[PDB]
């Protein structure tokens, strides 16, 4: 019948990287042939029978393509199985990178939605949005063209921890659709809530000048493993582990530093092994120098 | 009598062999009534007992929508588990979930349950007060911290006290003539020699519902629970169950042995003996 074809560790792979295609069929991983989409029954490499998983390394642009496999079925009309599921190897690093931004921003309240906009001054026929990780499938969208740029709006939601993480986008051009640009700079999409918000406070307080000290404490009865201090402007994503105090609160003191310039601060708690899942934000606090 | 409703989730990763799979089944007492399998072509929550089939489309669409979300959540929970235990992305792992409610004969809640397992071992469990957790190891202690800060117990409790009991009462009424009518076992005793001086007596119970049953062998009225071989109760395929119990007896002493059978469907317990 039907094998299960898979790419490891990722079907989206940089040129110079490595990816392996496995063809699992009748509780085995060996004796199979490969097929690209356009030549639906021309087995590739002159009908090579792969006696194990097929390791493409280093990846070249010629590895990019839309694959199926067939496993050896030695008692049947053609002697091979039906075609597998199709796996698309996408090879990146072949055009200049596009740009990725989040509207309204990269901190998304749980259950809500966010738009990730990919855009470029190169006219890309399609854009791909890819969450960083193992065995993650990309989203495709055609690029609209307007004002001398091409762009696509990827809607992400309802926000849960599965949709949070580090995202990149990519462009492809008309006649090499499995050939992807270099990746956009990454964007961390963080989900906030519903873990309870911590409390923000300053020591000795929110007003200071000169070379005097200004420490911000983020505090909570809940057992956050880490805190994140965030001042409006995006120029401080400072993170510190929490310490438990005698009164049972969990706290982290953030010493601002010798040249503190101030602004409006908020803090978030997060837990071990989950850096993209944050608590609700604390009430805001403004510091003045 | 008293009754129970249970949902069981199995989420499994199988790298290189398929995509992660989510299996959910629902039970009232010993009777499965719904299933969801993410490996189906178009996954849907689907009837598995006749008395749920006349629920409207609003019911099926709500259940299916929730099962798709749970499949997505538990696929992500498999990934989170890899990080908590520092395990490779190559291995295959299994999360199991159970929750549900027990009601009395008046239909009111007797207790609620919610337990989780990873790779076949206890992971975290909701305590009897339905407001606190018990964590089996330091990984599970992470989940407990998060669930306390997110007040997840209050959500379990609100379900266990409300929808769980109201739906179980609705289901028991829907399937009253098969769910609340105990079918008594059909019984007999068979005899096979093992030598010229000993023989097996096997006591049989067939066709009974629900699965709870007691089979016991006595010899001159004394329980042989030490020399009795009991087989696990097994399903017949038609929503009844089967079981046997066997004891080895000296040839010529068969009449000293009595098999005793207790089941809800029996007005009084049966005493059986082997008759040549």
């Amino acid at each position: 019948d039907k094998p299960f074809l898979s790419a490891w560790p990722s079907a989206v792979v940089p040129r110079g990287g490595h990816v392996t295609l496995r063809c699992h069929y009748r509780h085995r991983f060996n004796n199979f042939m490969l097929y690209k989409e356009d030549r639906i029954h021309i087995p590739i490499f002159h009908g090579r029978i792969f006696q194990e998983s097929f390791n493409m390394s280093p990846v070249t642009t010629a590895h990019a393509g839309n694959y199926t496999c067939r496993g050896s079925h030695p008692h049947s009309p053609t002697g091979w199985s039906a075609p597998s599921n199709p796996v698309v190897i996408m090879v990146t690093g072949n055009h200049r990178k596009p740009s990725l931004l989040a509207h309204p921003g990269p901190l998304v309240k749980s259950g809500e939605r966010v738009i990730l906009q990919c855009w470029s001054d190169i006219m890309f026929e399609h854009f791909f949005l890819h969450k960083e990780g193992i065995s993650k499938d990309p989203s495709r969208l055609v690029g609209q063209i307007h004002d001398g740029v091409s762009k696509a709006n990827f809607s992400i939601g309802p926000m849960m921890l599965a949709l949070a993480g580090t995202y990149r986008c990519y462009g492809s051009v008309t006649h090499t659709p499995y050939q992807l640009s270099a990746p956009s700079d990454p964007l961390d999409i963080v989900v906030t809530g519903p873990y309870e918000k911590p409390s923000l406070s300053a020591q000795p307080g929110p007003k200071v000048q000169a070379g005097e000290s200004v420490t911000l404490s983020c505090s909570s009865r809940s057992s956050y493993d880490m805190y994140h201090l965030s001042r409006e402007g995006g120029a401080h994503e400072r993170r510190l582990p929490a310490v438990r105090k005698v009164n049972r609160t969990f706290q982290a003191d953030f010493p601002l530093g010798p040249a503190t310039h101030g602004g409006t601060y908020r803090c978030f708690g997060s837990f071990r092994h989950s850096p993209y899942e944050w608590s609700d934000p604390s009430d805001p606090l403004l510091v003045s120098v | 009598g008293s009754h129970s409703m249970r949902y069981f989730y199995t989420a499994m990763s199988r790298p290189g062999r398929g995509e992660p799979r989510f299996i959910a089944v629902g039970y009232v007492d010993d009777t499965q009534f719904v299933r969801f399998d993410s490996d189906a072509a178009s996954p849907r929550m689907a009837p598995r007992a006749p008395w749920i089939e006349q629920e409207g489309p609003e019911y099926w669409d709500g259940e299916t929508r929730n099962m798709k979300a749970s499949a997505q959540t538990y696929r992500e929970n498999l990934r989170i588990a890899l990080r908590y235990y520092n395990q490779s992305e190559a291995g295959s792992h299994i999360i199991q979930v159970m929750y549900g409610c027990d009601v009395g004969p008046d239909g009111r809640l007797l207790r609620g349950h919610n337990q989780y397992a990873y790779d076949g071992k206890d992971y975290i469990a909701l305590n009897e007060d339905l407001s606190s957790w018990t964590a089996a190891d330091t990984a599970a202690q992470i989940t407990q911290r998060k669930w306390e800060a997110a007040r997840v117990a209050e959500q379990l409790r609100a379900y266990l006290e409300g929808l769980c009991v109201e739906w179980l009462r609705r289901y028991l009424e829907n399937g009253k003539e098969t769910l609340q009518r105990a079918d008594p076992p059909k019984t007999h005793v068979t005899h096979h020699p093992i030598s010229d001086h000993e023989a097996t007596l096997r006591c049989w119970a067939l066709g009974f519902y629900p699965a709870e049953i007691t089979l016991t062998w006595q010899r001159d009225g004394e329980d042989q629970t030490q020399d009795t071989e009991l087989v696990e109760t097994r399903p017949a395929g038609d929503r009844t169950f089967q079981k046997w119990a066997a004891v080895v007896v000296p040839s010529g002493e068969e009449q000293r042995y009595t098999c005793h059978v207790q089941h809800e469907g029996l007005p009084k317990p049966l005493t059986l003996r082997w008759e040549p």
Binding site: P158, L161, S274 | G26, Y159
Partner: peptide, 10 residues
């Protein structure tokens, strides 16, 4: 009917 736990992760 099944339990609906939107947004709850391990």
């Amino acid at each position: 009917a099944s339990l609906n736990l939107p947004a709850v992760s391990w």
